[PDB]
Design a binder for this molecule. Structure first.
Ligand SMILES: O=P(O)(O)[C@H](S)c1ccc(Cl)cc1Cl
Ligand SMILES: [Zn+2]
Length: 227
């Protein structure tokens, strides 16, 4: 299918968004409503995710987290706002989105000419530090710069699932926005937290991995140019 929504553990689901270059995002089905982690590529892909959500739950979509300011994590924002969901990020992500959205849309369209020229749609709930949702069961945090300066992790403690958006994946990927020397330092700050982790969801490539995806990507980025 163009997009799938599949249970990984309990209320934690993975979105495989096969539009453009495949990106994987998360959905958490909570008591009061639904939290989406990663807005998906465009308002149209966001609508496709919402259609899948409505086959699982009638509860409202409460909020969507932009794990960084890029098009694959924030492009769906216009749709989420339109249905009354909050769009949530760190202040750093929001500020970078304000200044750099035009640049990232242009960069996206260089690789994907078919991708739309999306207007800026900023987060309307901004956090200055780490933050939680769903009565503490969805936990967002910053551990330093990596793939972009601002990317955050989202941890689901009950299910021992870690999502890093674009930070964790199988292939090296684009480093044009990256801090190549800080990247492994951020991954080591992450590992030093000693979070119980059964599953890491990669943000690109095949999503389902164990904790070893962190070490896999760390070894790749240490061999990269500018390391
Ligand atoms: O940098 P990432 O991991 O988001 C990935 S490698 C990426 C790079 C360029 C373009 Cl146009 C699309 C994508 Cl999905
Ligand atoms: Zn990405």
């Amino acid at each position: 299918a163009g997009m799938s929504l599949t249970q990984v553990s309990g209320p934690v689901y993975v979105v495989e968004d096969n539009y453009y270059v495949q990106e994987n995002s998360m959905v958490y089905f909570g008591a009061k409503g639904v939290t989406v982690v990663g807005a998906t590529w465009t308002p149209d892909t966001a609508r496709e995710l919402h259609k899948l959500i409505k086959r699982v739950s009638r509860k409202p979509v409460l909020e969507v987290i932009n794990t960084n300011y890029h098009t694959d994590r924030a492009g769906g924002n216009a749709y989420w706002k339109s249905i009354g969901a909050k769009v949530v990020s760190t202040r750093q992500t929001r500020d970078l989105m304000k200044s750099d959205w035009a640049e990232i849309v242009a960069f996206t369209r260089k690789g994907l000419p078919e991708y739309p020229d999306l207007p800026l749609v900023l987060p309307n709930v901004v956090h200055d530090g780490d933050f939680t949702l769903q009565e503490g069961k969805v936990r967002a945090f910053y551990a330093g710069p990596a793939h972009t300066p601002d990317g955050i992790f989202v941890y689901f403690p009950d299910e021992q699932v870690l999502y890093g958006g674009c930070i964790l994946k199988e292939k090296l990927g684009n480093l044009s926005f990256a801090d190549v020397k800080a990247y492994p330092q951020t991954l080591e700050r992450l590992k030093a937290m000693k979070l119980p982790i059964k599953t890491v969801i990669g943000g690109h490539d095949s999503p389902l991995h164990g904790p070893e995806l962190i070490d896999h990507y760390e070894a790749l980025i240490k061999a990269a140019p500018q390391s």
